[PDB]
Amino acid sequence: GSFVEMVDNLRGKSGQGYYVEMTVGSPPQTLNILVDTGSSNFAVGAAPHPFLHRYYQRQLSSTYRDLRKGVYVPYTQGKWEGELGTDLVSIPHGPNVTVRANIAAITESDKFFINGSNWEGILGLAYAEIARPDDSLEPFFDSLVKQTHVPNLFSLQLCGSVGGSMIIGGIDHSLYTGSLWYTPIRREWYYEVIIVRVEINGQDLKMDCKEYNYDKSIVDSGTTNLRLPKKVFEAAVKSIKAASSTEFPDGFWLGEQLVCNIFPVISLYLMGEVTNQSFRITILPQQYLRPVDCYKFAISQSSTGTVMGAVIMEGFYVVFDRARKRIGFAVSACHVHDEFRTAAVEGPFVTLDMEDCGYN
C-alpha cells in the first residue's frame, strides 16, 4: 500500500505523453519510455533518428537475442516498423526485478518520434490480443508477471512539463482521497469499459447508452483528450454549447482553432461491480480545456469509439487491476482544482440495463 521508490517516476511535456525511465540489455542502456495503456508492444528507437536523444544499441548487449522477424505498425497518422528480439529489461524507479521481454527495435518510422520530445520508445501495457504482429508476442507486463512475483496490477497517477506516478504491482494510498470504485474490464484487449450514462453539469444526454460505447470505450494513457463518437460528441458539444451561452467560434468545437466558470462539469457513469449498480466520475473544464492563455478544446470525435485519455485520467488515480479484470478510479491527490469545484468519484447509483450499453 506504499511504494515510495515509484512515486513521481513519470515525466513528460504537455501533449507529448508521460514517460518512465527503463533500461534494456546488458550492461543496462537507459531509455525514456512512453507509458501507453492503448497498445501492447514494447518498441524502442534502435537507430540515430535526428529527434532521438539516444537509442537501443543491440551490438552492445550480451543478452540480446534476435527473433529474426519484422513487425510493421501503421496507426492514425503515422507508422513504426522494427525488428523483433528479446533482451533483459528493468525499471529503475520500479520493482527490483529484471525480465526477459520482447522488444521491437525500431528501424523505420514516420510521425512517430516527436521533434523536441524526451522519449525514445513506447511501453504497450494493454493485452496480447492487440499485440503486433499477433497475439503470440507476449506483452511486457505479461512477461513481468510470469517471470517474477510482481502482482498482476499497475496504477497510474497522471498529474499534468508534466509529472505523475506509475505504481507497478500495487496501489499507493497516498496517491488518492476517498474510495476506489471499480468498473469491469469488458474484454481484455484494449482496457475496455462501459459508460452507462453521461451528465453535463447534471443533465442527462438521454442518448441510448449503446452510443456512448460505439463501438468502444477504452482507458488510454497514450491519448491526450477525451474522445467521443461523433453522434455522442455532437450531442455532448450541443449541451456544452448551451451550458456556455454567456460567451466562441464553430472551429473551436472541432479543435480547428485555439481559444484565448461558465464551463460545465462532465460526469461519466461507469458500469459498477454489481448488477444494476454504477458509479460516476466527474471532471472539470480544467481537464477538458488544456493550455497550449490559449486552450485547445480537448474533446473530439472518433470512429473507433470513446477514448478516456489524459483529460479523464488526470482527474483520477487509475488502478489497472488485471488480476480481477477491473479498473478502479479514485479522486487523485494531485488533480488541479479551484475553490468551488473538485473532481469526484461517487456511488453507488442505480442504473438498469447496463448490458445494453455495450456493443457486440
Ligand X SMILES: Cn1c(N)nc([C@H]2C[C@H]2c2ccccc2)cc1=O
Q: Which stretch binds ligand X (CB under 6 A): 45-53, 218-226, 244-252, 333-341?
A: 218-226
Q: Which stretch binds ligand X (CB under 6 A): 7-15, 219-227, 235-243, 295-303?
A: 219-227
Dist CA 68 CA 63 (whole Å): 15
The separation between CA 37 and the C-alpha centre of its own chain, rounded to angstroms, equals: 5
The count of residues interacting with ligand X (CB under 6 A) is 12
Structure-block grid coordinates of residue 189:
484487449
Indicate whether 122 belongs to the interface with ligand X (CB under 6 A): yes
Structure-block grid coordinates of residue 10:
513519470
Shortest distance in whole angstroms from residue 221 CB to ligand X: 7
Dist CA 144 CA 140 (whole Å): 6
- Whether residue 215 is preceded by a cis peptide bond, meaning omega within 30 degrees of 0, is yes
Shortest distance in whole angstroms from residue 309 CB to ligand X: 8
Q: Which of 18, 19, 56, 112 binds ligand X (CB under 6 A)?
A: 112
* Binding flags for ligand X, 221-240, as an x/- string (CB under 6 A): -xx-----------------
Name residue 136's amino acid: S
Residue closer to ligand X by CB (options 1, 116) is 116
Do 199 and 229 meet the contact criterion of CB atoms below 8 Å apart?
Answer: no
Residue closer to ligand X by CB (options 17, 315) is 17
The CA dihedral of 67, 68, 72, 78, to the nearest 10 degrees, is 80
* Binding flags for ligand X, 22-41, as an x/- string (CB under 6 A): ------------x-x-xx--
Residue closer to ligand X by CB (options 19, 176) is 19
Shortest distance in whole angstroms from residue 15 CB to ligand X: 11
Name residue 88's amino acid: L
Kind plus residue range of the DSSP H or E element containing 236: helix 230-243
Ramachandran region, residue 210 (left: φ > 0; alpha: ψ -120 to 50; beta: rest): alpha
Residue closer to ligand X by CB (options 15, 170) is 15
b (16+ CB within 10 A) / e for 305-331: bbbbbbbbbbbbbbbbbbeeebbbbbb
Residue closer to ligand X by CB (options 220, 314) is 220
Q: Which of 211, 220, 314, 321 binds ligand X (CB under 6 A)?
A: 220
Shortest distance in whole angstroms from residue 303 CB to ligand X: 13
* Binding flags for ligand X, 145-184, as an x/- string (CB under 6 A): ----------------------------------------
Shortest distance in whole angstroms from residue 78 CB to ligand X: 6
Residue 248 CA neighbour count, 13 Å, CB half: 24
Q: What is the largest CA-CA distance in the chain?
A: 65
Residue closer to ligand X by CB (options 218, 235) is 218
Indicate whether 56 belongs to the interface with ligand X (CB under 6 A): no
Shortest distance in whole angstroms from residue 41 CB to ligand X: 8
| Coil, strand or helix at 346 | strand
Structure-block grid coordinates of residue 167:
505504481
* Three-point CA angle 334, 122, 14, nearest 5°: 40
Annotated catalytic residues are: 36, 220
Q: Which of 62, 76, 115, 161 binds ligand X (CB under 6 A)?
A: 76
Shortest distance in whole angstroms from residue 38 CB to ligand X: 3
Give me the residues that bind ligand X (CB under 6 A), please: 17, 34, 36, 38-39, 75-76, 112, 122, 220, 222-223
